[PDB]
Amino acid sequence: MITIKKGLDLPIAGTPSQVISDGKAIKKVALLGEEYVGMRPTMHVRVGDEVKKAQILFEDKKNPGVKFTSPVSGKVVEINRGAKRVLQSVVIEVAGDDQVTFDKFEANQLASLNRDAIKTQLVESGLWTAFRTRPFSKVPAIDSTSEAIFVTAMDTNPLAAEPTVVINEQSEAFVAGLDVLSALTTGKVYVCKKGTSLPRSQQPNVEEHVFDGPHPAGLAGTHMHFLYPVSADHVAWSINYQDVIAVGQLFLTGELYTQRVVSLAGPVVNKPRLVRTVMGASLEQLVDSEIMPGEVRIISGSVLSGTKATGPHAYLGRYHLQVSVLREGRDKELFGWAMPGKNKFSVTRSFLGHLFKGQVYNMTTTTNGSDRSMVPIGNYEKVMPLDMEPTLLLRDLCAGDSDSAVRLGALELDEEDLALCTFVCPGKYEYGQLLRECLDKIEKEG
């Protein structure tokens, strides 16, 4: 329905063959600590303690009431802490199947459940941590209520799992989740999907809008900027579709639903495909026997925006649905920058690669060139379909200004939205951290 013109697709080899196959056994699950932006934990477990599924692990100091639950039952083994004793990951060892049961419901009553009961059930089950507000991408406080729940039912990240295949196996659960969201929203529920067909909710609160085009069309930021512009005085909530499935199954069966479907793909994957696992799964265990020999890098989340998961961070993120493995490169090539490379990709037409339409590249992690001052040759303006001024906004963010950025429109953005901007930067900057610091300052000053 809405056509995005400016945008960039990433032709990186090793697309996942969209056939669900049962993934390898997993024995360690964990919760990351850094990605829950603005959360300082108050611990509730100690090394050696035994917990069950959906049991409380810790709570948030500056966001009271919210409880983060243990994905699987077992025994706590490792509590890693980094510099300044900041929490990194709470490691749970898989053992047994004990859990905690919750109230059940029928399908018909789902559309008329009370907001207070829904909030209490979601918070106690721990699934409430799925919602990310805008601005500031923070988990919503237990009492607030928005006017639009954005259900991201489409994915356009590189090597991303196809949502249609995953949803078509859980149609009843998706219907239940949409009914619950329509009862909770206090307003409208926008579900953004491609041209294909998805299971339908009968409530009149649910609106279906269709986006078409390159990568920036599959993000809550773009959905919101095009359908319900977020401001400092008008907040909206975003939730990925598998969390909707989990909500539906939770309200239908009375127990937490911890399954996941992630796309294990990349340049150095022997056989890319969809695998079935539990959130927080140890990528070290999951990637066994699926990788070619050589130095490699495990990335939770897409190659555009992800976390270098080696060590305490080697665990699948809460808000991530894909695993990308790509080959590391440390070769200093003579005349590499001036070599008219056939295999050197560029959105700019400055290389012979763009002549061969449809080519697939064997990408690496090298950063061509080094850090230099940004010279706006006109690259940011090709990859921002939003009605924002990219060249001015990026200079403003780099200058450290805060109120000017807020006026310019830095509120709608997020960490993952500037991924293309840092991807195309001639100066090889990283804008995610700059935007995060600016948003932190804006939130802290008032």
Residue 397: φ, ψ to 5°:
-65, -40
Contact 264, 323 (CB under 8 A): yes
User: Rule CB under 8 A: which of 65-84 touch another protein?
Assistant: 81, 84
Residue ranges with strand state E in 146-295: 148-152, 188-193, 206-212, 236-240, 259-265, 273-278
State the nearest-atom distance from the C-beta of 336 to another protein, in Å: 4
What 3-state class would DSSP assign to 106? Answer: coil
Residue 14: φ, ψ to 5°:
90, 45
At which residue do the structure tokens 């945008």 appear? 7
State the nearest-atom distance from the C-beta of 363 to another protein, in Å: 6
Cα–Cα distance measured from residue 235 to residue 145, given in angstroms and rounded to the nearest whole number = 9
State the nearest-atom distance from the C-beta of 275 to another protein, in Å: 21
- For residue 441, the surrounding DSSP H or E stretch is helix 431-445
Which one of 69-77, 148-156, 236-244, 326-334 is the stretch in contact with another protein (CB under 8 A)? 326-334
Amino acid sitting at position 215: H
Binding mask 26-55 for another protein (x = CB under 8 A): --------------x-x---x---------
Query: With binding defined as CB under 8 A, does residue 377 bind another protein?
Result: yes
Query: With binding defined as CB under 8 A, does residue 425 bind another protein?
Result: yes
Query: With binding defined as CB under 8 A, does residue 107 bind another protein?
Result: no
CA 205 to chain centre: 25
Cα–Cα distance measured from residue 263 to residue 165, given in angstroms and rounded to the nearest whole number = 12
State the nearest-atom distance from the C-beta of 103 to another protein, in Å: 32
Which one of 21-29, 117-125, 184-192, 334-342 is the stretch in contact with another protein (CB under 8 A)? 334-342
- For residue 171, the surrounding DSSP H or E stretch is helix 171-184
Q: Which two tokens stand for residue 148?
A: 């639009």
Between the CA of residue 60 and those of 157, 221, 327, 332, what are the distances in Å?
30, 25, 37, 46
Contact 268, 327 (CB under 8 A): yes
Q: Which of 4, 12, 118, 130 binds another protein (CB under 8 A)?
A: 12
Q: Which of 336, 360, 362, 443 binds another protein (CB under 8 A)?
A: 336
Q: How many residues bind another protein (CB under 8 A)?
A: 84
Relative to beta strand 2-3, strand 206-212 is: parallel
Q: Which of 229, 255, 291, 318 binds another protein (CB under 8 A)?
A: 229
User: Rule CB under 8 A: which of 392-411 touch another protein?
Assistant: 392, 395-396, 398-399, 401, 407-409
Q: Which of 108, 293, 332, 358 binds another protein (CB under 8 A)?
A: 332
User: Rule CB under 8 A: which of 286-315 touch another protein?
Assistant: 297, 299, 303-308
Cα–Cα distance measured from residue 344 to residue 164, given in angstroms and rounded to the nearest whole number = 33
State the nearest-atom distance from the C-beta of 397 to another protein, in Å: 11
Beta bridge partners, 149, equal 189, 237
Query: With binding defined as CB under 8 A, does residue 328 bind another protein?
Result: yes
Query: With binding defined as CB under 8 A, does residue 203 bind another protein?
Result: no
Which one of 101-109, 209-217, 277-285, 415-423 is the stretch in contact with another protein (CB under 8 A)? 415-423
* Degrees to nearest 5, angle at CA 97 with 52 and 130: 60
State the nearest-atom distance from the C-beta of 431 to another protein, in Å: 9
State the nearest-atom distance from the C-beta of 335 to another protein, in Å: 7
Binding mask 344-373 for another protein (x = CB under 8 A): xxxxxxxx-----------x-xxxxxxxxx
Q: Which of 424, 439, 440, 443 binds another protein (CB under 8 A)?
A: 424
State the nearest-atom distance from the C-beta of 215 to another protein, in Å: 13
Residue number with CB closer to another protein (261 or 394): 394
Cα atoms in the Cβ-side hemisphere of radius 13 Å centred on 51: 25
Residue number with CB closer to another protein (42 or 109): 42
Q: Which two tokens stand for residue 120?
A: 């209490």
Residue 437: φ, ψ to 5°:
-65, -40
